[model samples]
Target: AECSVDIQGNDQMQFNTNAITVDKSCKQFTVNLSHPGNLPKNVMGHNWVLSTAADMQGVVTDGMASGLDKDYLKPDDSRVIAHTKLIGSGEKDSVTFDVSKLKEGEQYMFFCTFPGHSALMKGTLTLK
Candidate 1:
C-alpha cells in the first residue's frame, strides 16, 4: 500500500530483511534504513546502497577505497542507482529513486558498504 519500506540493522552485522519488493504502481520508491545498535560508525556502521547485481562487487570494491567520509561509496558513481548515507547506532538514513530505473527480469541488489558488512548485509530487490 505504501511506496516505501523501513529496514533495520544492528551491531551483529546483519540486516533484518533479506529481500525487498517494490510495487510498480509507485512512481518512486524509498528505502528507510535504521541502525539500533550502540556501535560507532567506524566500527559497525551500516548503509543502504542500491545497484545492479552484476555491479555489486565492483561498487563495493571501489567503495572501500572511498572511505567513510564518502559513505564508503564512490563519488557520483553512475553504477549506483540510489544510496543512503552511512549510519551507525541510533542513526537512520533514507534514499529514494524513480521506479522506472528498475526493469523486469534484471537483477538488483542492495547492501551495506561498510567494509566486510556486505557478506551478510546484502539482499535482493525486485519489482512486482
Candidate 2:
C-alpha cells in the first residue's frame, strides 16, 4: 500500500483508526483527517497532532495558548512533528512529514489538542 492515509474522527472524541506504521522505504508520509461530528469547531473540533511521546505534554501545553483560530497549535512550533488544521463537522485537513524525522525504537503519539478532547483522543504510534 502507498504510504498515505485518510482517517476519521467524531463527536465522541475518538479516532476511528489508531496505530499507524510507517514503511521504511517511504520518503514522506501523509495523513488526511476527516471529521464527521455534528458539533462546530469551537465545540467538538478535532485536529491531529504528532510528536515524540516525551514531547507530547510540552507540545500540547504550548499549543493550548495558540487558540482555536490557529488550530490550537503554536505557529511554527518545532516540538511538533506534524499536524492538521482544526476541523469542524464535515471538514477535513491533512499533513505530510519526512519519514526520516522519526527515530526507530522511540515512542510516538497522535492526539487531539482541543482542550478536553485528549482525555479520550490519543493513541500510540511507532516507526517500524
In order, how many clashes per candidate? 0, 0
In model 1, what lDDT does residue 122 have?
A: 98
Q: After superposition, how far is residue 20 of candidate 1 from its true place, in Å?
A: 0.4
lDDT of 1 by residue, 1-128 (tens): 58999999999998899999998898999999999879999989899999999999999999988998998999988999999999999998889899999988988999998998899999999988
What would the per-residue lDDT of candidate 2 be over residues 1-128, giving only the tens digit for each residue?
47887888898888987788887788899999999858899988899999999999877888788898888888898988989888998997889999999978999999988887777888877777
Candidate 1 displacement at residue 90 in angstroms:
0.2
Q: For each candidate, what TM-score against the reference? A: 0.97, 0.94
The runs of at least 3 residues in candidate 2 whose Cα sits more than 4 Å from the true structure, single-residue gaps closed, are none
lDDT of each: 0.92, 0.86
Candidate 1: regions farther than 4 A off: none
Give residue 107's error in model 1 in angstroms: 0.8
